[PDB]
C-alpha cells in the first residue's frame, strides 16, 4: 500500500536458540516446563506439541516470525523440537 508506516504488530511466546540448548528430544514436558515453562499454545487433541511461535510485522516490508513447536510423545518424553524461521 502507498503508506509505509504501520502500528506494528507483536505476539511472541517463542523459544530462543538458548532455549533449544536448554532442552532436548527425550526430555519430559515437565523437563521443558522446569526450564521453559509451558507455551501459550499446546496440542489440544493430539500428542503434546508445545507451540512456541514468535510474530512481528515490519512496516509494509513483510512479517518477522520465529516458530518453535515441541512435539512430545503421550508420555511426555520429547520427540521433536520443530523450530521454524520466518515463513
Amino acid at each position: 500500500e502507498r503508506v509505509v508506516y504501520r502500528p506494528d504488530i507483536n505476539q511472541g511466546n517463542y523459544l530462543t536458540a538458548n532455549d533449544v540448548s536448554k532442552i532436548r528430544v527425550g526430555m519430559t514436558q515437565q523437563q521443558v516446563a522446569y526450564a521453559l515453562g509451558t507455551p501459550l499454545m499446546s496440542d489440544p487433541f493430539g500428542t503434546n506439541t508445545w507451540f512456541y511461535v514468535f510474530r512481528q510485522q515490519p512496516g509494509h516490508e513483510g512479517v518477522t516470525q520465529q516458530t518453535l513447536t515441541l512435539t512430545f510423545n503421550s508420555s511426555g518424553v520429547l520427540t521433536n523440537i520443530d523450530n521454524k524461521p520466518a515463513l
Binding site: 504488530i9 505476539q11 501459550l40 507451540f51 511461535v53 516458530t67
Partner: protein, 218 residues
C-alpha cells in the same frame, strides 16, 4: 410505607398492587409488612412476592437481596425452585437490558457477567429442582445461555482473527471448543483456528482441523 397494621391488611393491599402491577406501591406495602412482621404469616411468601415485585420494578439487586434474604431465611421452601429460577431470571435481567433491542443490536458481544450468574442459577435450578415448573423453562434458557457465551466468545474470536493474533486466535477458539460443540459459532470458529495455523505455519496442524472441517462439514 404502611404502619403497624394487621399482616393481611398490609398483605391484601400488597396483593392488590401486585395484581395491579403497581410494584412501587406494592413494595411500599410488601416491605411494610416485613417492617413489622418479617416473621409473619405472609413474610415467607412476601419475599417471593418481593422477588416478584422488585424484579418487575427493575429493583434487581433488591430482588437478589430479597433472594439472599430468602436464601438465609428459607434455604428450602416450595418456592426455592421459583427463587433459583428467579435468581437466574434476575441475573438474565442483570446481564443485558439495554434500549438497543428495538434498534436491532446484538448484546451477546457484551459482557455476560450475569448471564454467567444466570447460567449458574438456571443450572442450579435444573439440578437442584430437576422437575419443577421452572425447570422445563430454565433448561432451554441454559442452552441459549450457552449460545449467549458462544456469540460472546465468537465476538472476541472475531476480534483476534482480524487482529491476526493467531496465538490468541487459537486459545480463544480452543476455549469455544472446550465450552460447546453445538452452536454454529462452533463450526464458524472451526476454520479460524485452522486459519491461525497456516498463518503460524502450522499447516499440518491446520490439516488436523481440516479433517474436522471435513468431518464436521455436516
Amino acid at each position: 410505607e404502611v404502619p403497624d397494621n394487621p399482616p393481611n391488611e398490609i398483605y391484601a393491599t400488597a396483593q392488590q398492587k401486585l395484581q395491579d402491577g403497581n410494584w412501587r406501591q406494592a413494595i411500599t406495602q410488601l416491605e411494610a409488612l416485613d417492617n413489622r412482621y418479617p416473621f409473619g404469616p405472609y413474610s415467607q411468601q412476601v419475599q417471593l412476592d418481593l422477588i416478584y415485585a422488585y424484579y418487575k420494578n427493575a429493583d434487581l439487586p433488591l430482588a437478589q437481596a430479597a433472594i439472599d434474604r430468602f436464601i438465609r431465611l428459607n434455604p428450602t421452601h416450595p418456592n426455592i425452585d421459583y427463587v433459583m429460577y428467579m435468581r437466574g431470571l434476575t441475573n438474565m435481567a442483570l446481564d443485558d437490558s439495554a434500549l438497543q433491542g428495538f434498534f436491532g443490536v446484538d448484546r451477546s458481544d457484551r459482557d455476560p457477567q450475569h448471564a454467567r450468574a444466570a447460567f449458574s442459577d438456571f443450572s442450579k435450578l435444573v439440578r437442584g429442582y430437576p422437575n419443577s415448573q421452572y425447570t422445563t423453562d430454565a433448561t432451554k434458557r441454559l442452552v441459549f445461555l450457552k449460545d449467549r457465551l458462544a456469540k460472546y466468545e465468537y465476538s472476541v474470536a472475531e476480534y483476534y482473527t482480524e487482529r491476526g493474533a493467531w496465538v490468541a486466535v487459537v486459545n480463544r477458539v480452543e476455549g469455544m471448543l472446550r465450552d460447546y460443540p453445538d452452536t454454529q459459532a462452533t463450526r464458524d470458529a472451526l476454520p479460524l483456528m485452522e486459519n491461525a495455523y497456516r498463518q503460524m505455519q502450522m499447516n499440518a496442524q491446520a490439516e488436523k482441523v481440516a479433517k474436522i472441517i471435513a468431518a464436521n462439514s455436516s
